[PDB]
Structure formats: C-alpha cells, structure tokens
Amino acid sequence: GRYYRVAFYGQGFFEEEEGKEYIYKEPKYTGLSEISQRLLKLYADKFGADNVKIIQDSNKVNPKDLDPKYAYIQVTYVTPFFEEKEIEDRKTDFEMHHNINRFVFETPFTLSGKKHGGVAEQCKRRTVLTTSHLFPYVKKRIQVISQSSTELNPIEVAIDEMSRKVSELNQLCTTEEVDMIRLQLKLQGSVSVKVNAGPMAYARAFLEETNAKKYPDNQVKLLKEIFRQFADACGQALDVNERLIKEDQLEYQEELRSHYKDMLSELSAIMNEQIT
Amino acid sequence: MQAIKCVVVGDGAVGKTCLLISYTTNAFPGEYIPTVFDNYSANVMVDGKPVNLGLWDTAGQEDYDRLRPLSYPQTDVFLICFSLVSPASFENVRAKWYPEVRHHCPNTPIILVGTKLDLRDDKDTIEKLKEKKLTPITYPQGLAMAKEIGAVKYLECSALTQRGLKTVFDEAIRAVL
C-alpha cells in the first residue's frame, strides 16, 4: 500500500484524535490529493467546511502557529523504513511489505531559516516514525508513538544524491533487458541538465580549490571518488544507449555524447585529473 | 510494465518543474527536496494497467530552441503547459509551442495544461496583473485554445492545492493507451 503520516491539531474540534499522529495505510497507487481530499471532506462534515485546513509543512508542528478557529490536519507521504541490517534479512517483497512499524520522510531546511537554498546551503532532515503496532493490521491507521531524526549538511546531501545516482545508472546498465526509454530519461537527466542545477553544481560548490575550505578533507575526498564513479557510470550508460537507439535518435545520442564530454572536461579542470 | 515517454513543454516560469516534482514525489510543492538532475518518473495505475511514466522536463527559453527538439523522437504524448495567470505564456501556446511540436511530431497527441489554477482567483495575483492591464486566462479561453490547436484534452491544475494534478497524468497516459 501507500503510507501517509496524518496528525491532528484542533483544540476546539478534535476529541480522542487531538494531538495524535498516525500512519494511514492506503490502497496501492493512492496519491496525495486523494487521501488529503478524503480527510478534508470527512472532518469538514463534522466541523464545518470553512473550519478545516490541511497543513502541508512536513516539519513538526508547533501549535502556537495555529489559529484556534480552525481544525488542522497535517498530511505527509512516508515510505517503509529499513536499516541495512533489516534490508538483507528480508528476501522476498512479501517481507518488506510485512511486519513494518517504521516509516520515513524527508524535510528540506537551511540553517538561515529559509526552507530552500542552492546546493551550498540546502540541508535535509530524515524523520523516522514508529507505530504502536505492526502492519498489516486490522485497522487502516496506527498511532505513531515515537520519532527519530537525523540531518544532512550540504556536502552530505551532495554525497547522498551523487552516490544514489551512480547506483541507479549502474543498475540500468546491468539490467538483462534494458528499457531504453527509462535509460534515456536518467542518462539525459545526468549529462544534459538544462533546467535544474546539474551535477556539476556539486563539483563547483564542494570540490573547487578556489572556494574557501569548509568541510573535512575526508568528505571532500569521498565526494571526489563518487564523481569519478559518476563519470564512469555516465559513460557506460551512454555506451548502452548507443546499442539500443535506432536511426531516429542518432543526432540525439551524439548531442548527449557532446554534453558528456563537456562535463568531463569541466570535472577534469576542477579535480586537476584527466577524467575519462 | 509499459514505459511511456511524455514530453512537457511551455514557457519558463509556468510551474512545470514544480508540478512534475510534486506529482512524482507525492509531496506538496513547498516540501520538495531540490535535485540537481533533470526529468522525473512514476509508476502509475491507469484503468487497471500499470505503467512507468517518464516525464521529460524541457527548457522553454529561446536559448534552448535549437537543441530542444532532439528530445522529441520516441515521444508518446506531449503536455503543452501555460500559466493561467500569465497571458504571455498562453499566447506562446499558439505562437511557439503548438507549431514547434507539430513541425517535429505531426501525429503525437497533445494535451493542453493550464497551471497555477489556485492563482486565478488569488486577490494578490489579480491586482498585480491589473498593473499591466492583464487578467487571468479563463476556462472558456483555455478550452478555445485547445480547440484551435487540436489538443485531445484541456486540463487545469494547481500544484499547491493538488487539484487536477492526478488527472493531468492519468489523461496523458489514456491518450497513449
């Protein structure tokens, strides 16, 4: 199923549910608008439609921010959380869908107080919620009874996002029957970024020697090694795409290669190494 | 699982990336986790069929006009987006985006998407448009444009309220399936 955190705040409105937080288990493929609208209509029928509001902020609510004229419902998508010790003991998919009581979501923040920033400022919080009972369960929701959180600073965000991209690209290249459209989406989204900042934004912010030093040497060294792996993964993905394409995508492929070569040229200049 | 390529075009600053991130991460737009990478994907269930929807996020500005059509081969469906509170982006549906898509892809279904639905009634937004003697795009006007360009659907959505968001991508898939 699809799991959501739902938390109720409404001193003049809620009774048993006041100040409580639950994980709701929804049918597979349930989207955020579907559960949010159902919850909104359900409690609007109890309290009045002008009197119920959704809290979209995923940070822990401070009730001092809330207007006592309204009942509030905080809704946030979560996914089942497993530590690396759990992810190995659980062979089948029936085992990562069975006996689960921990759920994770991520919140963006920066240390200035702004919620978002560029790659040198953007931090991320990972919050794990633990329910009082295990799913699967007789009820559709289970109360959250504890939370834990960790936070990633900007270079840790870069290390996390770049490491995950390397694994994702390598996975696509080793799949027995590569889905060309899925490969191209991720490949083009790595070597030919035009809308978002591009992976070289991390290299400029954290690896360039003309920036003032800010992070431990060992973390800079780790990010450098991940970028070496990213360069390699992009090249391998480009070679797989070369075999898959038909004539209609020759010009597209050659443009991806040109962008890839330009990216390696810039990375080489930043790292003072001849990269591929 | 059937893989579907959907290419999203339209002027910059109509909210395209925000919508794509919000839909594919199942999160409200204010809570998005910035990514440095482009394009998005989702596993979707439409009329009992599971599909992987690949969403190409294209740069709309003129500097990218020359290379943007290289993303069009193998496309199954186009979303042409404009902001309901940007008359300029609406006019470019007719002056730029519809002609560009059809020059390259004569037979691919087009869905016309009006974004920022929540701002059409926003008092603040309404007043600032009045400063330049402008007014939001109404639903009849959007529908009239969809008729003009031969779009198979006309849909309005809001990333902020999530209204109409699920329907955009369900209908993108139904235009292919």
From Swiss-Prot, chain A:
Tissues expressed in: Expressed in brain, lung, spleen, mesenteric lymph nodes (MLN) and thymus. Expressed by B and T splenocytes. In brain, expressed by Purkinje cells during postnatal development and hippocampal neurons.
Location in the cell: Nucleus; Cytoplasm; Cell projection, Dendritic spine
Observed effect of gene inactivation: Knockout mice are viable and fertile. They show decreased numbers of B-cells in spleen, both follicular B-cells and marginal zone B-cells, and in peripheral blood, but not in bone marrow. Their percentage of splenic CD8(+) T-cells is decreased comparing to wild types.
Swiss-Prot/TrEMBL induction comment: Isoform 4: Highly induced by IL4 in B splenocytes, but not T splenocytes.
Domain of life, source organism: Eukaryota
Other comments on record: 'Zizim' means 'spike' in Hebrew.
Role played: Guanine nucleotide-exchange factor (GEF) that activates CDC42 and RAC1 by exchanging bound GDP for free GTP. Essential for dendritic spine morphogenesis in Purkinje cells and in hippocampal neurons, via a CDC42-mediated pathway. Sustains B-cell lymphopoiesis in secondary lymphoid tissues and regulates FCER2/CD23 expression.
Family: Belongs to the DOCK family.
Comment on protein domains: The DOCKER domain may mediate some GEF activity.
Protein name: Dedicator of cytokinesis protein 10
Species for this entry: Mus musculus (Mouse)
First and last residues shown, out of full length: 1875 to 2150 of 2187
Swiss-Prot record, chain B:
InterPro entries to which the protein is assigned, alphabetical: P-loop_NTPase, Small_GTP-bd, Small_GTPase, Small_GTPase_Rho
Molecular-function annotations in GO: enzyme binding; G protein activity; GTP binding; GTP-dependent protein binding; GTPase activity; protein kinase binding; protein-containing complex binding; Rho GDP-dissociation inhibitor binding
Effect after changing residue 51 to M: In MRD48; decreased substrate adhesion-dependent cell spreading; weak dominant-negative effect
Topology in membrane: Lipid-anchor
Post-translational modification summary for this protein: GTP-bound active form is ubiquitinated at Lys-147 by HACE1, leading to its degradation by the proteasome. Phosphorylated by AKT at Ser-71.
Enzyme class: hydrolase
NCBIfam families named among the record's database cross-references: small_GTP (TIGR00231)
Full protein name: Ras-related C3 botulinum toxin substrate 1
Source organism of this protein record: Homo sapiens (Human)
Taxon lineage: Eukaryota, Metazoa, Chordata, Craniata, Vertebrata
